[PDB]
């Protein structure tokens, strides 16, 4: 998760890596 | 209930008037429990909100805790209709804990924000302040009542998921107005509405630097208990883009200014149209060879967008109408106004010259008529009749003759009432030259381009936007990418026919509530399942059909279109908001 700091700090916004939107989906869905 | 929006202190979009109009009905529904949340702006506290230094009668401890803990908040009354209870939250009051907040924001909804985008950081801190305020309130509210949270804008909605991350027993409603990435899709020279089934959303958000904005927009949409969207087509594009079907659609309503008499909106059209004629006469001195009682006024308004507003399709439709009118041998002539605010400098010398010539002709007529009045008064006093053997005077004919000599002109009338800064790259003028509309005598379609908002301070056209709209005969709005559409709704409220498309939110909304939308004057098009040529041909057919009716038929059409104002009023649109709030409450806590 540390390596994911700078990627969203100065605006890399990686999209073909292991940080796609579903990577946020499958942990936000557990919130409800 | 809590309304969260970024447009409470600044008028950057149309959400301001929507919220201002909805405040009355929301307050009438919710009594004194209606609170609204908005950012604090230095420019929006002078004549925009009455600050209340006194504590809220039902809330004293949370404000004291918030003030003592460092952040600065204000309570007061919004300077709008009804009774609003507004809270303003400063953006710099808690600007000293952005690092800590984003450190503890990594595990909540996993959103990252660039450091050089001040607006995104301001929205994030606003969301943090809002969720902190909700937490403090529910901690200090003894958990007796139930709180429902409504979010109207995506910047203000970033905190919504934060509440969902804090297990707060509240109903979560997410309302969107338009897709940000969709706006940039339409400028990519790629078909958008016919390819709605296949979007490579991740990358197109990636290389276009709008990745994170869509990221927390979709996060808020997914996390919300209920999701609402402005119109049906916007709901469809959200479902095919955000991968979440909205529970219900929420069209925007507008307050209607009723009159004592039903027909008064006709009278406002009668005189305002006259103000247009005095303009067009001035713009057509030396070429007034057509009867002005058989003239139609078409217009298209809004922001200067070429493809997204349908200026081009209107232009070639008018060209086809002109070509058709020169083979039918008809005397009807139409005038099309383009209220497209662009960047301009100074005025047009020919237009002002025409206005001055019209005024000079009026002065000459006034002098001659005063002389005639004096002579007629004398003859009536002596007890006789005017035989017109002395009105000639052998002198007034000289001045009238030289006036007519001055009125003579050789060059063609101009197409613009201003002076363009650039002419080799202006789409409107290039298209007009290409299609061949030069306001010639043999033509039947006239084009007038006025790249400036209409105001009473202008030298020419001394009318505002509302009166000019009320004066026209039919507004043509062939929108292509329009989320909801305010101008056609305004025209419908004013009581004039309009032309719209199912692509626009207003057209789709009207097409699904009233059967046969042709007798009421809301001419609908089909730009979704038809090609450009089919759409322009249908528009030309509609224009010819409008030109075909008589004056009585036009009066019938306008009278019937006037009655549809009740459909767009908030009194009818509040039902959808009530349903959405009730569904959210049921989903959160039975
Ligand atoms: O709407 P029009 O075809 O321009 O008709 C012209 C005027 O319309 C309305 O204002 C009234 O009916 C007037 O009595 C009529 O003179």
Curated annotation (Swiss-Prot), chain A:
Compartments, as annotated in UniProt: Cytoplasm; Nucleus
Transmembrane segments: none
Tissue spec. comment: Highly expressed in skeletal muscle and heart, with lower levels in brain, lung, kidney and pancreas.
Signal peptide: none
The record's account of how the chain is modified after translation: Phosphorylated.
Subunit (UniProt): Part of the GYS1-GYG1 complex, a heterooctamer composed of a tetramer of GYS1 and 2 dimers of GYG1, where each GYS1 protomer binds to one GYG1 subunit (via GYG1 C-terminus); the GYS1 tetramer may dissociate from GYG1 dimers to continue glycogen polymerization on its own. May also form a heterooctamer complex with GYS2 (via GYG1 C-terminus).
Role description: Glycogenin participates in the glycogen biosynthetic process along with glycogen synthase and glycogen branching enzyme. It catalyzes the formation of a short alpha (1,4)-glucosyl chain covalently attached via a glucose 1-O-tyrosyl linkage to internal tyrosine residues and these chains act as primers for the elongation reaction catalyzed by glycogen synthase.
Family: Belongs to the glycosyltransferase 8 family. Glycogenin subfamily.
Disease implication from the record: Glycogen storage disease 15: A metabolic disorder resulting in muscle weakness, associated with the glycogen depletion in skeletal muscle, and cardiac arrhythmia, associated with the accumulation of abnormal storage material in the heart. The skeletal muscle shows a marked predominance of slow-twitch, oxidative muscle fibers and mitochondrial proliferation.
Protein name: Glycogenin-1
Organism encoding this protein: Homo sapiens
Taxonomic placement: Eukaryota, Metazoa, Chordata, Craniata, Vertebrata
Gene name as annotated: GYG1
Swiss-Prot record, chain B:
E.C. designation(s): 2.4.1.11
Regulation: Allosteric activation by glucose-6-phosphate. Phosphorylation reduces enzyme activity by constraining a tense conformation of the tetramer through inter-subunit interaction. Phosphorylation reduces the activity towards UDP-glucose. When in the non-phosphorylated state, glycogen synthase does not require glucose-6-phosphate as an allosteric activator; when phosphorylated it does.
Binding site for UDP: 11, 303, 487
GO molecular function: alpha-1,4-glucan glucosyltransferase (UDP-glucose donor) activity; D-glucose binding; glycogen synthase activity, transferring glucose-1-phosphate
Pathway of action: Glycan biosynthesis; glycogen biosynthesis
UniProt catalytic activity: [(1->4)-alpha-D-glucosyl](n) + UDP-alpha-D-glucose = [(1->4)-alpha-D-glucosyl](n+1) + UDP + H(+)
Family: Belongs to the glycosyltransferase 3 family.
Name of the protein: Glycogen [starch] synthase, muscle
Protein source organism: Homo sapiens
Lineage, opening ranks: Eukaryota, Metazoa, Chordata, Craniata, Vertebrata
Shown segment, full-protein numbering: 29 to 618 of 737
């Amino acid at each position: 998760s540390e390596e994911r700091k700078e990627r969203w700090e100065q605006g890399q916004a990686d999209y073909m890596g292991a940080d796609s939107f579903d990577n946020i989906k499958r942990k936000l869905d557990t919130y409800l | 209930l809590f309304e969260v929006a970024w447009e409470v202190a600044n008028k950057v979009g149309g959400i301001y008037t929507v919220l201002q109009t909805k405040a009355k009905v929301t307050g009438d529904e919710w009594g004194d429990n209606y609170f609204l949340v908005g950012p604090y702006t230095e420019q929006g506290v002078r004549t925009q909100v009455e600050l209340l230094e006194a504590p809220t009668p039902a809330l004293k401890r949370t404000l004291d805790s918030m003030n003592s803990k460092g952040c600065k908040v204000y309570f007061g009354r919004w300077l709008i209709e009804g009774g609003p209870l507004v809270v303003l939250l400063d953006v710099g009051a808690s600007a000293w804990a952005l690092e800590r907040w984003k450190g503890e924001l990594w595990d909540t909804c996993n959103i990252g924000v660039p450091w050089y985008d001040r607006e995104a950081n301001d929205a994030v801190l606003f969301g943090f302040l809002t969720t902190w305020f909700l937490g403090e309130f529910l901690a200090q509210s003894e958990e007796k009542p139930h709180v429902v949270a409504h979010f109207h804008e995506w910047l203000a909605g970033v905190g919504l998921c934060l509440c969902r991350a804090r297990r707060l027993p509240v109903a979560t409603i997410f309302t969107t107005h338009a897709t940000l990435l969709g706006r940039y899709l339409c400028a990519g020279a790629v078909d958008f509405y016919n390819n709605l089934e296949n979007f490579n959303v991740d990358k197109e958000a990636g290389e276009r630097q709008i990745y994170h904005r869509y990221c927390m927009e979709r996060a808020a949409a997914h996390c919300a208990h209920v999701f609402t969207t402005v119109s049906q087509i916007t709901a469809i594009e959200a479902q095919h883009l955000l991968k979440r079907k909205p529970d219900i659609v929420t069209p925007n309503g507008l307050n209607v200014k009723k009159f004592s008499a039903m027909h008064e909106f006709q009278n406002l059209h009668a005189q305002s149209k006259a103000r247009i004629q005095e303009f067009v006469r001035g713009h057509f001195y030396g070429h007034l060879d057509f009867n002005l009682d058989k003239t139609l006024y078409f217009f298209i308004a809004g922001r200067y967008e070429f493809s997204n507003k349908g200026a081009d399709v209107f232009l070639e439709a008018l060209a086809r109408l002109n070509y058709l009118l020169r083979v039918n041998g008809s005397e009807q002539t139409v005038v099309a106004f383009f209220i497209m605010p662009a960047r301009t400098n100074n005025f047009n010398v020919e237009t002002l010259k025409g206005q001055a010539v019209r005024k000079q002709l009026w002065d000459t007529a006034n002098t001659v008529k005063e002389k005639f009045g004096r002579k007629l008064y004398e003859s009536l006093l002596v007890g006789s009749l005017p035989d017109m053997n002395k009105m000639l005077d052998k002198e007034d004919f000289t001045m009238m003759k030289r006036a007519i000599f001055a009125t003579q002109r050789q060059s063609f009338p101009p197409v613009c009432t201003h002076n363009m800064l650039d002419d080799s790259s202006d789409p409107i003028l290039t298209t007009i030259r290409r299609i061949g509309l030069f306001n010639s005598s043999a033509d039947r379609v006239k084009v007038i381009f006025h790249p400036e908002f209409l105001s009473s301070t202008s030298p020419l056209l001394p009318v505002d936007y509302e009166e000019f709209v009320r004066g026209c005969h039919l507004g043509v709005f062939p929108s292509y990418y329009e989320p909801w559409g305010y101008t056609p709704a305004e025209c419908t409220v004013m009581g004039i026919p309009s032309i719209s498309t199912n692509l626009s939110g207003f057209g789709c909304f009207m097409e699904e509530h009233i059967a046969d939308p042709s007798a009421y004057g809301i001419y609908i098009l089909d730009r979704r399942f038809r090609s450009l040529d089919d759409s322009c041909s249908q528009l030309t057919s509609f224009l010819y059909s409008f030109c075909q009716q008589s004056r009585r038929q036009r009066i019938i059409q306008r009278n019937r279109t006037e009655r549809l104002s009740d459909l767009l009023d908030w009194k009818y649109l509040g039902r959808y908001y009530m349903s959405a709030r009730h569904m959210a409450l049921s989903k959160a806590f039975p």
